[PDB]
């Protein structure tokens, strides 16, 4: 029941922050600390990113809120996608290394 | 109550080790040596194999 994403609800929603420029909040539905922690740690590697963090306010409500603040050089969505792509490439490299080590 | 399986704390299968544990206890083996012979390095599995009480025998007899 909890595994299935709610019907009619998108996994990731984009909401811009009016008070702070170049600030946005990403609400990831049906996510846990696994994705949030690695995304937060990957975002810190980017130089343009200023604020990177995630929170899980309600354990019962399986949602993850990710807040990204960047300089006047890249959009928060661009940094988010870049971090996801870098993490995917790292996973590919780790899989290749493990496959080589097994053989 | 038969020996519990899957070692509630750890998750390791211990269902098929009760007969071996009893056989080791039949010989001149202490509880620690018997548990070590079964390759149980975590004390949760050792507790599960040591704190179990065989109650199914009384259920079958009575």
């Amino acid at each position: 029941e909890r595994f299935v994403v709610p019907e009619g609800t998108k996994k990731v929603s984009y909401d811009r922050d009016t008070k702070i420029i170049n600030a946005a909040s990403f609400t990831v539905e049906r996510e846990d600390h696994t994705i949030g922690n690695i995304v937060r740690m990957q975002l810190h590697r980017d130089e343009n990113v200023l604020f990177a963090g995630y929170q899980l306010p309600h354990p019962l409500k399986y949602k993850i809120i990710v807040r990204i603040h960047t300089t006047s050089q890249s959009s928060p969505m661009q940094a988010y996608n870049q971090a996801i792509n870098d993490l995917d490439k790292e996973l590919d490299y780790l899989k290749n290394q493990f496959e080589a080590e097994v053989a | 109550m038969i020996i519990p399986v899957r070692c509630f704390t750890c998750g390791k299968v211990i269902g098929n080790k009760w007969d071996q544990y009893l056989d080791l206890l039949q010989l001149d083996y202490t509880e620690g040596d018997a548990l070590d012979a079964l390759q149980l390095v975590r004390y949760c599995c050792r507790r599960m194999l040591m704190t179990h009480v065989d109650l199914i025998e009384k259920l079958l007899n009575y």
């Binding site: 870098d86 780790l94 097994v102 | -």
Partner: protein
């Protein structure tokens, strides 16, 4: 700003036990890999049990619960579809994709007590045969008579719910500490104090070399991060005698499987599932 380049070195590899070292990566990646391999890797296990004869002293629900915990070979877990996702059938008996049928029938016609193990559990698909380790997992013990006949169905599931679809068994990782010795304050210490310092360590992390009459670092991976030697050195009056700090970019992984899948295959499946999760989380650009 870009991706990392982790390095993997395998120390020991077996069917159910794997120990490898992961380097040049953050703690978050290792923790996420551990969590995925302990709670996200799917396996096949019995969830629905139908019985007709239950003359055994044990209750029906107890038998069903202890049947659901039996480890089964899960080589097809990745390819199989979920029961809720399977739309070809509503779910009854054997299915070509989701459900696997199991039949058990035990009748005791002898004075000796009959033990219903996991070996006498037959399935239509040979690939879903329960893992054999021995005498097998004892299900029910039967006296004279007391027949037990049941029909069971096994479905693919995630280890997050009911904690019975988890193939991993306490997968761990450490930071692989590095030991630093001043080697100058040791000369001031007497022979008696060196022995006491050696005995202070809970595990065999430091050794005494008889030829050089000085302490050496042996097996640095078994430190367990217990501040016993540091406290002993501070008590003896030497504050900076031994400095031990964890290494943030080095890790040593220990993966123990339950027999459902191979440990290397478990790691590969965890990596694939993490990649799929990242792909699903990925958000398309909007203009």
């Amino acid at each position: 700003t870009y991706q990392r380049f982790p390095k993997i070195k395998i120390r020991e590899l077996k069917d159910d036990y794997a120990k490898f070292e992961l380097r040049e990566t953050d703690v978050s990646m290792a923790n996420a890999l551990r969590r995925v391999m302990i709670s996200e890797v799917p396996t096949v296990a019995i969830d629905l049990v139908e019985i007709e004869v239950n003359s055994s002293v044990l209750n029906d629900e107890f038998i069903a619960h202890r049947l659901g915990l039996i480890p089964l070979t899960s080589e097809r877990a990745m390819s199989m579809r979920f029961s809720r996702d399977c739309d070809a059938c509503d779910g009854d008996g054997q299915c070509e994709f989701c459900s696997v049928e199991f039949r058990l029938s035990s009748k005791c016609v002898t004075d000796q007590t009959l033990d219903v193990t996991s070996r006498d559990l037959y399935s239509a698909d040979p690939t879903v045969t329960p893992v054999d380790f021995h005498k097998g997992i004892i299900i029910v013990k039967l006296r004279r008579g007391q027949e037990l006949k049941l029909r069971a169905i096994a479905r693919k599931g995630i280890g997050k719910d009911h904690a019975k679809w988890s193939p991993a068994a306490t997968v761990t990782f450490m930071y692989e500490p590095d030991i630093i010795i001043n080697e100058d304050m040791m000369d001031t210490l007497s022979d008696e104090e060196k022995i006491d310092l050696i005995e202070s360590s809970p595990t065999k992390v430091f050794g005494m070399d008889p030829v050089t009459r000085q302490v050496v670092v042996v097996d640095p991976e078994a430190y367990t991060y217990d501040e016993e030697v540091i406290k002993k050195a501070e008590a003896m009056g030497k504050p900076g005698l031994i400095e031990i700090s964890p290494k943030d970019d080095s890790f040593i992984f220990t993966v123990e499987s339950t027999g459902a899948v191979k440990a290397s295959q478990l790691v590969l499946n965890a990596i694939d599932l993490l990649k799929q999760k990242l792909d699903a989380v990925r958000l398309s650009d909007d203009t």
